[PDB]
RNA sequence: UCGA
């Protein structure tokens, strides 16, 4: 068992994939870093999901896993799994395949506004979300939203500013409040698989 | 003697106490000088022992606390016919004392 | 198998209880099983009687009692506790003025108890209190080295119990007395005693007018009071001569039984020497207001009578065992108890002044801290209190019977010359002349004889059989050396028919002097040869054929023998191997007759005649002090009928109740390819195959997790920056799992400690930023396996804070212990030895095909070089080899007693009987003599070994009777060109093993002040390059090597850093700098106000402190 | 106290 802080990495690309991991608590992102420095969110790892999948087939990790929240993960030895464990791994990997393909579809569906609304609504169903008086909210930066909506920070900030002017959302301190679920739902069109 | 200070040292500090007594002595009270002197000499010796006996210097009141813990443990071991536990010492010390404080006190008092 | 015992000597008595020297001493000291009212005045009782009553209110001693131990022995060993019993004393405080009597039973602390085997348990560890030999108290007369015709009288009390008084006759003619480095005329002290000129004249007049010189008018003129004041002014200058002060001082110096105590042996020796009777243990008395002499006058009289040359007066031999006594456990313990009691008494006296003079109990008056401190000091920190040697039962058995001349109240190493280390004639039957340490400790450490016992006076006695007329009785008398010197004592091997002496001339002793004597002159006779030697020496067969110097090594090395899993008794025994095991207490025996109900690995249940069902648990794989495994195995089966004293379970290093210190191997005596060079040993891999010389060893590891000001240390499985591979064998709590195999580098117990605060270097900042990973708060302080060790984890013990029954030292949260055991096979570098002093290291292990072999295909086990025998002169191993051969083929074992054993003819006979089996079998199998056997026989008759003309069979028999056989070289197949000695030998595997001693270091821990590498393998230290090594390097003219030793490899910090970096970078090492110990030297010389300045050729200052040490 |  091991705990990770926000922005801390669990493993790096090109490093030995000796350990398979399962997320117990929090939210993890699987990403790829380009030479030009652009960061792209490839997929979301939720509690119960297995990641570091490279340990099951290769010798080294191909992608970088970064904790988005305080996270609790469990280390596992691939060669030491029984029938039941392999069953859980297979089923969960299938689930993550479905979700990553749905995410694929999401990235190419609708304009930036719709993609942003959809991503916000998706995050609303993750450990990245919480709630207080102002309403439901998600702890996420504009940079991360850009990384997960196939765009760059600036444009995302612009669209979010538009939504603030329209009263759909509110933002402060890397924290975004979803004030009108119905309107965001209409903007997104189709919802993104949360499980 | 035997409390960590040499005989001569105790003698000298005692002499200092004697000086204090000489400066403070009022002959009108008709009490003999030795009576008044003895208290000041005893005080000077005790203060000296409390001050100089340890390589790692410990505050006088804290030294008193340590000594009280010592005598307490001695009494308890004398009645129980064996070495006392931390809880028993804490009980015998009365209000404010638990096992943690006794242990910490013993640790602090380590030479 | 059959057991054939030799020897015609019949011992009327068996060996005494071997641990009785400890057991009886401590039993006498404690008097625990004696009811308080019936206790004699000895030991603890004597201490109390001496310390009390405390006068100043008066505190008096009534009686004491000892309770039962709060915890058993095993529990004490487990929890690191001292095995002890609570001591209480009933005391009554009396006010002589009022008549007031307040009585209470006060707790004085605990007193350590002796175990069944005669040892102690101190803080969880087993310890032994070694008896200490010294000069017996009394009155001695020695020749004055300066003046030949004169003598010195020495008055000796017990150690720490008084000063030594010396009576001397000065050249001026006056008799001087020496006390506390001061000398004065004895006449003065005599006058203080109340002597008058008349009495001294009539008493001392006879002795050649010696008295006239002593007489002094001025002294006799003044009365004893003025003489007392005068004496006080002489002994204590500057001290005002108050009369009561003089009385007190002189009394305290001479007549005070509290400050001056002659021994009981002192009193007895004084009475015997001077022919008088002492009213007490003091030199004088204070009675009816005055002083009364006791000792002084008879000693002066004896001195004069000796000086005058009066017959019947002798000088005393100070190395004579009549004048030298043993202080056993009881005496020492009682002594320290007496000291602590005296301190307690001081505390009481101080408490009887302060506070309220009216309301006082004995509980308020008595502080037992000084007593407990004194006793704990004795058991823990004394030199006579030693870490128990329990490699094997014989080790501890010998340890308990050892006698040291060192320790407190005794000789230092420089003090001991030739006189003390020598073997005295009186050592016969008392102190073993053989068993003593080689080297600096020679003669200082010795061993108690087998039949010897220490009497109540502290003198070693030895038994003798009475001989009246020519008839030898069966009654035995234990005599001291002094009483022994009176009679004429015949040897034990003197021929006897029945109880009658059968020799016309016998060998006897008179005062140690050997003499030929008629049977009518025979007053006594030795009980047995065994009484002359120690327990270890008596286990050496054919001792008479072994030179003493090697027998010494044999004796000492038997102690070092490691318990083997397949251990066997020797084929040639002395018959003492059963008794050693029995007295050792390691092995288990049946109390009474009965039937065995249950037999298990863990326990044996026995149903006796009484019907009572007794269950004996067995010790399994326990770790001894030296890390050897002590374990008991059941030798009986369920439903077996056993008698009283019958073996139930075998202890460690024992076979069927017999002492098994090693294994019986087939040995050949011959050189082999220089692998036997200089005492080296070659062994067969077959030994490893069948698990011979395999031993179990357990090591103890410990780690503490304590509270720190930086936060609590925690023992956990969660260890920073570690892979799952590293944490594999650790449980949930972080402790290694039982049964797991651990190797060097592996984690035993996981632990994290809060990192000390610091500022990260800019490099660390940049790194942290690059990887985007926060630096963890805790650091990995886990206990790991040291280099060269490791094995299987057999046990785990964890003790926390706040759990029932356990409490640690202050600040310590929890302690975890992990016990790791390992199976050690015999390997290259391990040390082997026999009982005859032959020792060597295993240099080569050959495959079976390379081993020399008998014609019938049987390969030998061990190959010993014959070059080791002639110079060492230990021939016992040869005879053991022959008899071992005979026993090997006849399938039997033998008992050859000390000095009366199997002789050559009988061994030849056995060799013939063996040859019948070795050859007759072959001839019956339809096989004749071999060609190579014929060639070897040819070369043999060329050597004059066999008689020419006899048949090959007869010649082979002739060779076999010489203990030699035909041997084939396994490599070539061709035989050895000559007959070679082959037979069964008993060989032990010693405690010195390469695995423990192999060590190496690149870089590591350095010392605080010197900044030089540490010492010892345990600290991962470097080797010490000493003065002589430096001399060697200088003589080689190797300046850069020497400079490396003095700088880069030691205390040159910049130098060693730069050197390491250079080596790992592939660069050549840089020029070295100033050694730090020189800077330390300079500053330490500055502390002594000496200015040390390093100068250049221009005599200008050079700064070796590099900008650091000056403002 | 060992070992050489």
Quote the Cα angle for C364-C368-C370, to 5°: 130
Residues with Cβ within 8 Å of residue C96, at least 6 apart in sequence: C57, C58
- Give the separation between CA C93 and CA C105, rounded to whole angstroms: 11
Residues with Cβ within 8 Å of residue C854, at least 6 apart in sequence: C860, C965, C966, C967, C968, C982
- Closest nucleotide to residue C402 (Cα to C1')? D1
Taking phi over 0 as left and psi of -120 to 50 as alpha, with beta for the rest, A136 belongs to beta
Which helix (H) or strand (E) segment holds residue C61: the answer is strand C58-66
Residue closest to C71 by CA, chosen among C63, C81, C62, C61:
C81
DSSP string, C537-567: GGG-TTGGGB-HHHHHHHHHHHTTBPPPTT-
- CB atoms under 10 Å from CB of C52, counted, come to 18
- Give the separation between CA B104 and CA B89, rounded to whole angstroms: 13
CATH number at residue C686: 2.40.270.10
Is residue C534 included in any domain, yes or no?
yes
- Which pair of structure tokens corresponds to residue C529? 């040869």
Q: Are residues C430 and C573 in the same domain?
A: yes
Q: Among C507, C527, C547, give the residue marking a domain's end.
A: C527
Quote the Cα angle for C819-C823-C825, to 5°: 150
Question: How far apart, in Å, do the first and last CA atoms of chain A sit?
Answer: 24
DSSP string, C7-56: --PPPSSPPPPTTHHHHHHHHHHH--SS-GGG--S-HHHHHHHHH--B--
Residue closest to C114 by CA, chosen among C97, C127, C123, C132:
C127
Judged on CB neighbours under 10 Å (0-12, 13-18, 19+), C548 is middle
Residue closest to C934 by CA, chosen among C919, C955, C916, C914:
C955
Q: Is the dihedral of CA A63, A65, A68, A74 positive or negative?
A: positive
Residues with Cβ within 8 Å of residue C117, at least 6 apart in sequence: C19, C396, C400, C584, C585
H-assigned helices in C360-435: 362-365, 369-381, 393-400, 418-421
Q: Among C795, C825, C855, give the residue marking a domain's end.
A: C825
Residues with Cβ within 8 Å of residue C929, at least 6 apart in sequence: C952, C953, C956
- Give the separation between CA C701 and CA C899, rounded to whole angstroms: 48
Q: Are residues C128 and C231 in the same domain?
A: no
Helix (H, G, I), strand (E, B) or coil at C135: strand
Reported as half-sphere exposure (CB side, CA atoms, 13 A), residue A164 has a value of: 11
- Give the separation between CA C56 and CA C1075, rounded to whole angstroms: 63
Contact criterion met (CB < 8 Å) for B85 and C363: no
Which helix (H) or strand (E) segment holds residue B14: the answer is helix B7-24
DSSP string, C256-292: -TTT----HHHHHHHHHHHT---SSSSSEEEETTEEE
- CB atoms under 10 Å from CB of C855, counted, come to 19
Residues of chain C positioned with their CB less than 8 A from the CB of A75: 724
Q: Are C757 and C715 in contact (CB under 8 A)?
A: no
C811 touches chain A (CB under 8 A): no
Q: Are A188 and A178 in contact (CB under 8 A)?
A: no
- Which pair of structure tokens corresponds to residue C873? 């002169």
- Give the separation between CA C544 and CA C549, rounded to whole angstroms: 12
- Give the separation between CA C398 and CA C388, rounded to whole angstroms: 11
Q: Are residues C564 and C594 in the same domain?
A: no
B90 is in an annotated binding site: yes
Structure determined by: X-ray
Q: Are C459 and C450 in contact (CB under 8 A)?
A: no
Q: Are C962 and C977 in contact (CB under 8 A)?
A: no
How far is residue C505 CA from its own chain's centroid?
A: 43
C388 contact to strand D (CB, 7 A limit): no
Is residue C213 included in any domain, yes or no?
yes
Residues with Cβ within 8 Å of residue C542, at least 6 apart in sequence: C572, C836, C875, C876, C877, C879, C880, C896, C901
Q: Are residues C200 and C299 in the same domain?
A: yes
Judged on CB neighbours under 10 Å (0-12, 13-18, 19+), A172 is exposed
- Which pair of structure tokens corresponds to residue C351? 């408490």
Q: Are residues C544 and C401 in the same domain?
A: yes
Q: Are C634 and C587 in contact (CB under 8 A)?
A: no
C439 contact to strand D (CB, 7 A limit): yes
Phi, psi of C18 (to 5 degrees): -75, -30
Quote the Cα angle for C756-C758-C760, to 5°: 135
Judged on CB neighbours under 10 Å (0-12, 13-18, 19+), C489 is buried
Residue closest to C41 by CA, chosen among C33, C49, C30:
C49
* Total residues found in chain A within this entry: 195
Is the link from the previous residue into A87 a cis peptide, with omega within 30 of 0?
no
C404 contact to strand D (CB, 7 A limit): yes
Please identify among residues 659-718 of chain C the ones whose CB lies closer than 8 Å to any CB of chain A.
718
Contact criterion met (CB < 8 Å) for C811 and B82: no
Which domain does C860 fall in, by range? Answer: 1-6+661-693+826-990
CA torsion C726-C731-C736-C742 (nearest 10°) is -40
Number of domains in chain C: 6
- Which pair of structure tokens corresponds to residue C372? 């407990």
DSSP string, C959-983: HHTTTEE--B-TTT-PBPSS-EEEE
CA of A37, closest CA in chain C: separation in Å?
A: 13
Per 3-state DSSP, chain A is made up of helix, strand and coil in percentages (nearest 5) of 35, 30, 35
- Give the separation between CA A48 and CA A93, rounded to whole angstroms: 11
Q: Are C296 and C284 in contact (CB under 8 A)?
A: yes
- For residue C980, what are the β-bridge partners? C965
Q: Are residues C143 and C163 in the same domain?
A: yes
Is residue C1070 included in any domain, yes or no?
no
Resolution in A: 4.4
Q: Are C313 and C305 in contact (CB under 8 A)?
A: yes
Q: Are residues C205 and C307 in the same domain?
A: yes
Reported as half-sphere exposure (CB side, CA atoms, 13 A), residue A190 has a value of: 11
Residue closest to A45 by CA, chosen among A28, A21, A31:
A28
| Subunit partners of chain C (3 or more CB pairs within 8 A) | A, B
Residue closest to C362 by CA, chosen among C43, C101, C675:
C101
Contact criterion met (CB < 8 Å) for A9 and C772: yes
Q: Are residues C343 and C399 in the same domain?
A: yes
Q: Over the Cα atoms of chain A, what is R_g?
A: 17
C451 CA vs D1 C1’ separation (Å): 26
DSSP class of residue C568 equals: B
Residue nearest to nucleotide D4 (CA to C1'): C439
Is residue C908 included in any domain, yes or no?
yes
- Give the separation between CA C981 and CA C945, rounded to whole angstroms: 13
Q: Are residues C130 and C75 in the same domain?
A: yes
- For residue A91, what are the β-bridge partners? none
DSSP class of residue C599 equals: E
- Give the separation between CA C428 and CA C1050, rounded to whole angstroms: 54
- CB atoms under 10 Å from CB of C351, counted, come to 17
Contact criterion met (CB < 8 Å) for C368 and B78: yes
- Which pair of structure tokens corresponds to residue C463? 């038994």
DSSP class of residue A37 equals: -
Per 3-state DSSP, chain B is made up of helix, strand and coil in percentages (nearest 5) of 70, 0, 30
For C65, C155, C253, C545, the CA distances from C180, given in Å and listed in that order, are: 40, 13, 10, 52
C278 contact to strand D (CB, 7 A limit): no
Residue closest to C674 by CA, chosen among C844, C873, C834, C862:
C844
Identify the CATH assignment for B58-111 out of 3.40.50.300, 1.10.10.10, 3.20.20.70, 3.30.200.20: 1.10.10.10
Is residue C985 included in any domain, yes or no?
yes
3-state secondary structure labels for all residues of C688-724:
HHCCCCCEEEEEEEEEEEECCCCCCCECCCCCCCCCH
DSSP class of residue C776 equals: P
CATH number at residue C724: 2.40.50.150
Residue closest to C655 by CA, chosen among C643, C664, C665:
C664
Judged on CB neighbours under 10 Å (0-12, 13-18, 19+), C799 is middle
- For residue C266, what are the β-bridge partners? none
- CB atoms under 10 Å from CB of A38, counted, come to 11
Residue closest to C613 by CA, chosen among C626, C602, C598:
C598
Which helix (H) or strand (E) segment holds residue C186: the answer is helix C186-192
Contact criterion met (CB < 8 Å) for A18 and C718: no
Residue nearest to nucleotide D1 (CA to C1'): C386
- Which pair of structure tokens corresponds to residue C504? 């016309």
Return the residue in A3, A6, A8, A15 with the most chain C beta carbons within 10 A, the one to mutate for interface testing. Answer: A8
Q: Are residues C683 and C707 in the same domain?
A: no
Helix (H, G, I), strand (E, B) or coil at C112: strand
Q: Are C900 and C526 in contact (CB under 8 A)?
A: no
Q: Are residues C172 and C197 in the same domain?
A: yes
DSSP class of residue C487 equals: S
Q: Are C829 and C656 in contact (CB under 8 A)?
A: no
Judged on CB neighbours under 10 Å (0-12, 13-18, 19+), C1095 is exposed
Residues of chain C positioned with their CB less than 8 A from the CB of B106: 810
- Give the separation between CA C587 and CA C602, rounded to whole angstroms: 14
Contact criterion met (CB < 8 Å) for A9 and C774: no
Q: Among C802, C825, C848, give the residue marking a domain's end.
A: C825
Q: Are C292 and C280 in contact (CB under 8 A)?
A: no
Which helix (H) or strand (E) segment holds residue C247: the answer is helix C243-250
Of B74, B79, B103, nearest to C810 by CB-CB distance is B103
Helix (H, G, I), strand (E, B) or coil at C953: helix
Residues with Cβ within 8 Å of residue A172, at least 6 apart in sequence: none
Q: Regarding beta strands C812-824 and C695-706, do their DSSP bridges make them parallel or antiparallel, or are they unpaired?
A: antiparallel
Is residue C354 included in any domain, yes or no?
yes
C560 contact to strand D (CB, 7 A limit): yes
Q: Over the Cα atoms of chain C, what is R_g?
A: 36
Is residue C1030 included in any domain, yes or no?
no
Which letter, b or e, does each residue of C623-662 get, where b requires 16 or more Cβ atoms within 10 Å of its Cβ? bbbbbbbbbbebbbeeeeebeeebbbbbbbbbbebbbbbb
- Which pair of structure tokens corresponds to residue A168? 């759909």
Which letter, b or e, does each residue of B16-35 get, where b requires 16 or more Cβ atoms within 10 Å of its Cβ? ebbebbeeeeeeeeeeeeee
C550 CA vs D4 C1’ separation (Å): 16
Q: Are residues C699 and C844 in the same domain?
A: no
Residues with Cβ within 8 Å of residue C377, at least 6 apart in sequence: C336
Q: Are C1093 and C1071 in contact (CB under 8 A)?
A: no
Residues with Cβ within 8 Å of residue C16, at least 6 apart in sequence: C450, C451, C452, C453
């Amino acid at each position: 068992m091991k705990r990770f802080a926000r922005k801390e990495t669990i493993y790096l690309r090109g490093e030995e994939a000796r350990t398979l991991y399962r997320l117990e608590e929090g939210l993890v992102r699987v990403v790829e870093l380009l030479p030009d420095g652009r960061l792209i969110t490839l997929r979301h790892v939720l509690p119960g999901d297995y990641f570091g999948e490279e340990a099951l087939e290769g010798k080294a990790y191909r992608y970088t896993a970064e904790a988005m929240t305080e996270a609790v993960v469990q280390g596992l030895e691939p060669r030491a799994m029984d029938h039941e464990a392999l069953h859980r791994v297979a089923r969960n990997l299938a689930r993550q395949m479905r979700r990553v393909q749905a995410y694929e579809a999401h990235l190419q569906t609708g304009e930036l506004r719709a993609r942003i609304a959809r991503y916000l609504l998706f995050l609303a169903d993750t450990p990245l979300s919480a709630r207080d008086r102002q309403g439901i909210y998600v702890t996420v930066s504009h940079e991360e939203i850009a990384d997960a909506t196939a765009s760059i920070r600036e444009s995302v900030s612009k669209v979010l500013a538009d939504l603030r002017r329209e009263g759909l959302i509110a933002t402060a301190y890397r924290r975004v409040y979803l004030l009108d679920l119905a309107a965001l739902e209409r903007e997104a069109g189709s919802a993104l698989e949360a499980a | 003697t035997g409390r960590g200070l040499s005989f001569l040292d105790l003698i000298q500090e005692g002499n200092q106490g004697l000086i204090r007594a000489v400066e403070k002595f009022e002959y009108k009270r008709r009490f003999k000088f030795s009576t008044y002197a003895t208290w000041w000499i005893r005080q000077a010796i005790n203060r000296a022992i409390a001050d100089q006996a340890r390589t790692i210097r410990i505050p006088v009141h804290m030294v008193e606390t340590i000594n009280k813990l010592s005598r307490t443990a001695r009494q308890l071991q004398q009645e129980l016919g064996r070495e006392p536990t931390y809880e028993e010492i804490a009980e015998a010390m009365g209000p404010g004392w638990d096992a943690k404080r006794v242990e910490e006190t013993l640790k602090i008092a380590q030479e | 198998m059959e057991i054939k015992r030799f020897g015609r000597i019949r011992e009327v008595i068996p060996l005494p209880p071997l641990t009785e020297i400890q057991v009886e001493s401590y039993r006498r000291a404690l008097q625990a099983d004696v009811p308080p009212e019936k206790r004699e005045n000895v030991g603890i009782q004597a201490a109390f009687r001496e310390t009390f009553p405390i006068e100043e209110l008066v505190l008096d001693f009534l009686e004491y009692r000892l309770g039962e131990p709060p915890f058993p022995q095993d529990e004490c060993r487990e929890k690191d506790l001292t095995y002890q019993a609570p001591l209480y004393a009933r005391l009554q405080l009396i006010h002589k003025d009022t008549g007031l009597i307040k009585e209470d039973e006060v707790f004085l602390g605990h007193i350590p108890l002796m175990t069944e085997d005669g040892s102690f348990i101190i803080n969880g560890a087993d310890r032994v209190i070694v008896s200490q030999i010294h000069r017996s108290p009394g009155v001695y007369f020695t020749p004055d080295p300066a003046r030949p015709g004169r003598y010195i009288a020495s008055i000796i009390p017990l150690p720490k119990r008084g000063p030594w008084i010396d009576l001397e006759v000065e050249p001026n003619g006056v008799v001087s007395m020496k006390v506390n480095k001061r000398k004065f005329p004895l006449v003065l002290l005599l006058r203080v005693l109340g002597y008058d000129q008349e009495t001294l004249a009539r008493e001392l007049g006879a002795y050649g007018e010696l008295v006239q010189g002593l007489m002094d008018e001025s002294v006799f003129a003044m009365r004893p009071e003025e003489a007392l004041i005068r004496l006080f002014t002489l002994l204590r200058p500057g001290d005002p001569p108050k009369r009561d002060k003089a009385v007190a001082y002189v009394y305290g110096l001479i007549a005070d039984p509290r400050r001056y105590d002659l021994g009981e042996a002192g009193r007895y020796k004084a009475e015997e020497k001077l022919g008088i009777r002492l009213s007490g243990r003091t030199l004088a008395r204070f009675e009816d207001g005055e002083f009364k002499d006791e000792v002084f006058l008879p000693t002066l009289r004896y001195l004069f009578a000796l000086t005058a040359g009066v017959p019947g007066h002798e000088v005393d031999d100070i190395d004579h065992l009549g004048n030298r006594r043993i202080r056993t456990v009881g005496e020492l313990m009682t002594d320290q108890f007496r000291v602590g009691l005296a301190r307690l008494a001081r505390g009481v006296r101080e408490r009887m002044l302060m506070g309220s003079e009216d309301s006082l109990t004995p509980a308020k008056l008595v502080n037992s801290r000084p007593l407990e401190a004194a006793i704990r000091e004795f058991f823990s920190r004394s030199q006579l209190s030693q870490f128990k040697d329990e490699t094997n039962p014989l080790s501890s058995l010998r340890h308990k019977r050892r006698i040291s001349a060192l320790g407190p109240g005794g000789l230092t190493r420089e003090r001991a010359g030739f006189d003390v280390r020598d073997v005295h004639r009186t050592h016969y039957g008392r102190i073993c002349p053989v068993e003593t340490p080689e080297g600096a400790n020679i003669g200082l450490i010795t061993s108690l004889a087998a039949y010897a016992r220490v009497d109540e006076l502290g003198f070693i006695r030895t038994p003798y059989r009475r001989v009246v007329g020519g008839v030898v009785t069966d009654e035995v008398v234990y005599m001291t050396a002094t009483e022994e010197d009176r009679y004429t004592i015949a040897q034990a091997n003197t021929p006897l028919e029945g109880n009658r002496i059968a020799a016309e001339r016998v060998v006897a002793r008179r005062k140690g002097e050997p003499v030929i004597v008629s049977p009518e002159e025979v007053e006594f006779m030795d009980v047995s040869p065994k009484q002359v030697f120690s327990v270890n020496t008596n286990l050496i067969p054919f001792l008479e054929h072994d030179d003493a110097n090697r027998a010494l090594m044999g004796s000492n090395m038997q102690t070092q023998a490691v318990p083997l899993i397949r251990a066997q008794a020797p084929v040639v025994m002395t018959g003492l191997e059963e008794r050693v095991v029995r007295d050792s207490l390691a092995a288990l025996y049946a109390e009474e007759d009965g039937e065995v109900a249950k037999v298990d690995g863990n326990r044996i249940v026995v149903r006796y005649e009484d019907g009572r069902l007794v269950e004996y648990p067995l010790r399994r794989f326990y770790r001894s002090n030296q890390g050897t495994a002590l374990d008991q195995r059941p030798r009986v089966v369920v439903g077996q009928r056993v008698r009283k004293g019958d073996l139930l379970a075998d202890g460690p290093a024992s076979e069927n109740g017999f002492l098994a210190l090693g294994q019986n191997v087939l040995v050949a005596i011959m050189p082999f390819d220089g692998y036997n060079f200089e005492d080296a040993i070659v062994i067969s891999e077959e030994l490893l195959k069948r698990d011979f010389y395999t031993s179990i060893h357990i090591e103890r590891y410990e780690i503490e997790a304590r509270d720190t000001k930086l936060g609590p240390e925690r023992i956990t499985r969660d260890i920073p920056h570690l892979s799952e591979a590293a944490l594999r064998d650790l449980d949930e709590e972080g402790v290694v799992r039982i049964g797991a195999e651990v190797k060097p580098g592996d984690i035993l117990v996981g632990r994290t400690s809060f990192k000390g605060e610091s500022e990260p270097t800019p490099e660390e900042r940049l790194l942290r930023s690059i990887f985007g990973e926060k630096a963890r708060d805790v650091k990995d302080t886990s206990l790991r396996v040291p280099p060269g060790e490791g094995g299987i984890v057999v046990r785990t013990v964890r003790l926390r804070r706040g759990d029932p029954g356990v409490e640690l030292k202050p600040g310590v949260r929890e302690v975890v212990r992990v016990y790791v055991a390992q199976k050690r096979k015999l390997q290259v570098g391990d040390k082997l030895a026999n009982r005859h002093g032959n020792k060597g290291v295993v240099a080569k292990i050959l495959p079976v095909e390379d081993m020399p072999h008998l014609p019938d295909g049987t390969p030998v086990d061990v190959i010993l070089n014959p070059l080791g025998v002639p110079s060492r002169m230990n021939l016992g191993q040869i005879l053991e080899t022959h008899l071992g051969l005979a026993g090997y083929f006849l399938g039997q074992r033998y008992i050859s007693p000390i000095f009366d054993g199997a002789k050559e003819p009988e061994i030849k006979e056995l060799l013939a009987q063996a040859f019948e089996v070795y050859f007759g079998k072959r001839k019956g199998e339809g096989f004749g003599v071999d060609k190579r056997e014929v060639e070897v026989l040819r070369r043999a008759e060329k050597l004059g070994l066999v008689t020419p003309g006899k048949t090959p069979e007869e010649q082979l028999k002739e060779l076999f009777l010489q203990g030699k056989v035909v041997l084939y070289d396994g490599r070539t197949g061709e035989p050895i060109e000559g007959p070679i000695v082959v037979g069964q030998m008993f060989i032990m595997k010693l405690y010195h093993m390469v695995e423990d001693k192999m060590h190496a270091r690149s870089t590591g821990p350095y010392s605080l002040i010197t900044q030089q590498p540490l010492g010892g393998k345990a600290q991962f230290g470097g080797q010490r390059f000493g003065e002589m090594e430096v001399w060697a390097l200088e003589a080689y003219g190797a300046a850069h090597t020497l400079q490396e030793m003095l700088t880069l490899k030691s205390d040159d910090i910049e130098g060693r850093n730069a050197a390491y970096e250079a080596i790992i970078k592939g660069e050549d090492v840089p020029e070295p700098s100033v050694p730090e110990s020189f800077r330390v030297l300079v500053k330490e010389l500055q502390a002594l106000a000496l200015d040390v300045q390093t100068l250049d050729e221009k005599d200008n200052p050079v700064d070796i402190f590099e900008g650091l040490a000056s403002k």
